[PDB]
């Protein structure tokens, strides 16, 4: 029941994701090495991982149909506001419900609650992030749904600082209609509505995690000792 336009959107988003997400995690070898002894020994490594991820998210975004047709300032506000959410979302692909960690091809590049702690984040945030990862994994999303959800996340008309909310909504609506139809092609009612509703609740949760973080990254990076351990792109993006 997917039209050609809908199929073309999915195809573009699959390519973009495949181009910007290397399931071998080979590039990780070029980050500052992880250290698990040392206040914030994991901060250099995870800062490099976050920074790299921001670059990749930007790459994915630029391929979202219509995104690059937005103004430069709208593209920036959208990316600054969504980066962390898309990172979290995209990270579900490495996440495993075995031990509740992100497994990027080895023990050295396998990240757990304590690793994240040693990057300067409290368990109080870290735990809701793990829970989110669990809930998302349980959806057993198809890659088609996964990339649509990332794209919906980025092109949200309700992000602070957006000027042409209507244009951003026009893109988002096409993506949401594509996702809904794809879901319908896989699942009759009411399973279809159930799954969609859960995907929407995941985007709400990400907003919440985003808000909560901003307050935390404000106190972490406020410290000059910490901010110095980050990267230029991370400073630019997270203000």
């Amino acid at each position: 029941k997917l039209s050609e336009e809908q199929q073309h959107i999915i195809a573009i988003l699959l390519d973009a994701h495949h181009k910007t997400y290397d399931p071998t995690y080979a590039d990780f070898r070029d980050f500052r090495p992880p250290v698990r002894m040392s206040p914030l020994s994991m901060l250099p490594h995870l800062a490099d991982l976050v920074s790299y991820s921001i670059q990749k998210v930007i790459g994915f975004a630029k391929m979202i149909p219509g995104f690059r047709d937005l103004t430069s300032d709208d593209q920036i506000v959208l990316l600054k506001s969504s980066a962390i959410e898309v990172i979290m979302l995209r990270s579900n692909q490495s996440f495993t419900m075995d031990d509740m960690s992100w497994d990027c091809g080895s023990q050295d590049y396998k990240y757990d609650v304590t690793d994240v702690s040693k990057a300067g984040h409290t368990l109080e945030l870290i735990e809701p992030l793990i829970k989110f990862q669990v809930g998302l994994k349980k959806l057993n999303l198809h890659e088609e749904e996964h990339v649509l959800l990332m794209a919906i996340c980025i092109v949200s008309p309700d992000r602070p600082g957006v000027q042409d909310a209507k244009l951003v909504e026009a893109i988002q609506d096409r993506l949401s209609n594509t996702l809904q139809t794809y879901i319908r092609c896989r699942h009759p009612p009411p399973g279809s509505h159930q799954l969609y509703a859960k995907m929407i609740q995941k985007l709400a949760d990400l907003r919440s995690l985003n808000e909560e973080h901003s307050k935390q990254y404000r106190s972490l990076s406020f410290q000059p000792e910490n901010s110095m351990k980050l990267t230029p792109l991370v400073l630019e993006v997270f203000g």
């Binding site: 670059q55 930007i58 630029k62 690059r68 593209q75 990316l79 600054k80 230029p232 792109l233 630019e236």
Partner: peptide
């Protein structure tokens, strides 16, 4: 503020 690196990654 200015975002020269994000701008550059977008073009």
């Amino acid at each position: 503020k200015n975002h020269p690196m994000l701008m550059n990654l977008l073009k």
